[PDB]
Amino acid sequence: PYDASKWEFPRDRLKLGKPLGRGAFGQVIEADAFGIDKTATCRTVAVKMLKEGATHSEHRALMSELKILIHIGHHLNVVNLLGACTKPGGPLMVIVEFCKFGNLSTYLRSKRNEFVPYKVAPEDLYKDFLTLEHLICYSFQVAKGMEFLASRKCIHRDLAARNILLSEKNVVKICDFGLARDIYKDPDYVRKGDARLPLKWMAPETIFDRVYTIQSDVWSFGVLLWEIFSLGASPYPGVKIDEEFCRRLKEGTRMRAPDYTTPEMYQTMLDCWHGEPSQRPTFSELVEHLGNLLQANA
Numbered sequence: 001p002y003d004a005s006k007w008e009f010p011r012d013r014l015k016l017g018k019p020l021g022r023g024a025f026g027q028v029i030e031a032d033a034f035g036i037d038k039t040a041t042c043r044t045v046a047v048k049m050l051k052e053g054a055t056h057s058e059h060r061a062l063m064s065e066l067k068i069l070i071h072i073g074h075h076l077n078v079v080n081l082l083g084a085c086t087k088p089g090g091p092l093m094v095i096v097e098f099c100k101f102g103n104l105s106t107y108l109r110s111k112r113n114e115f116v117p118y119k120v121a122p123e124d125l126y127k128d129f130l131t132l133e134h135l136i137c138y139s140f141q142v143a144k145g146m147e148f149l150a151s152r153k154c155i156h157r158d159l160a161a162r163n164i165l166l167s168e169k170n171v172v173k174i175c176d177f178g179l180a181r182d183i184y185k186d187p188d189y190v191r192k193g194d195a196r197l198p199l200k201w202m203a204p205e206t207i208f209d210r211v212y213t214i215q216s217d218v219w220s221f222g223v224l225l226w227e228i229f230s231l232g233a234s235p236y237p238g239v240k241i242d243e244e245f246c247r248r249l250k251e252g253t254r255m256r257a258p259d260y261t262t263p264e265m266y267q268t269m270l271d272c273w274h275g276e277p278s279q280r281p282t283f284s285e286l287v288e289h290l291g292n293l294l295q296a297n298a
């Protein structure tokens, strides 16, 4: 359902700005919302809306997404829904908290040179570098977000570092650009049947049987871990994404360890990549595991 008394935000109280992500039919825009949260307070927000080319079907899909985000609720590691513009005579707009640093994939890749496994040096004390603690922390935060989302009976279907955002104080948030990404222009999406699917993140039961579950999200999570500990590299490097790739993956062929991983983190990847979906760990198990890794790290 949609409770307008709670979620409806007047279009006039929203000041639209620069594009944040653009698709063919959808887009995410930066905006200035007046009193969306705390009474009479300006706040930077990100708005998802449709663009030229979009049809009634994309409009329907955007309303479903808004209703799903309403149903989800608040969690520190899930992008937070602030409101919506659903009234006639204007476009449908889904408003969320702004995440300053953008997607995790671009962010890690940009900071790849500023990576030091451990900050042991006394001179390095006052420098904003990426450490193994930071990477384990992001991995653990995504798992807490995915555990929360699992408890809400949701399935993501496109978990990847491109769908993780970085906010202030190293807080990561799960998101879904969806229509705000041009998948027909994007290389992470490969043509399979009548659609463009994120093949490199998909579990084998999804590539062949089109079966999406919380455990197939765990597989994607394993691929996301590879993205994190590769510092934003593209999965399966040098591999042609075709029928031979799909065949080998079902047989048990896995990715090699990324250049910045710890043996245990690659083991956690391998566990997430177990062929049988029931044998892959749960998000609740990954929270405790990654939580222990972060406590041992200190």
Ligand SMILES: CC#CC1=Nc2ccc(NC(=O)Cc3ncc(Oc4ccnc5cc(OC)ccc45)cc3OC)cc2C(C)(C)O1
Residues within 6 Å of the ligand: 020, 021, 028, 046, 047, 048, 065, 068, 069, 078, 079, 094, 095, 096, 097, 098, 099, 100, 101, 102, 103, 146, 149, 150, 154, 155, 156, 157, 165, 174, 175, 176, 177, 217
């Ligand atoms: C189990 C499970 C699960 C599960 N989890 C979800 C989590 C999130 C969503 N949808 C969204 O977040 C919509 C959305 N995504 C990214 C958006 O882009 C941004 C925002 C904030 N800051 C951004 C800064 C930026 O550059 C600096 C650039 C972009 C940004 C906006 C935006 O809405 C407006 C959907 C789901 C579904 C699939 C329903 O399921």
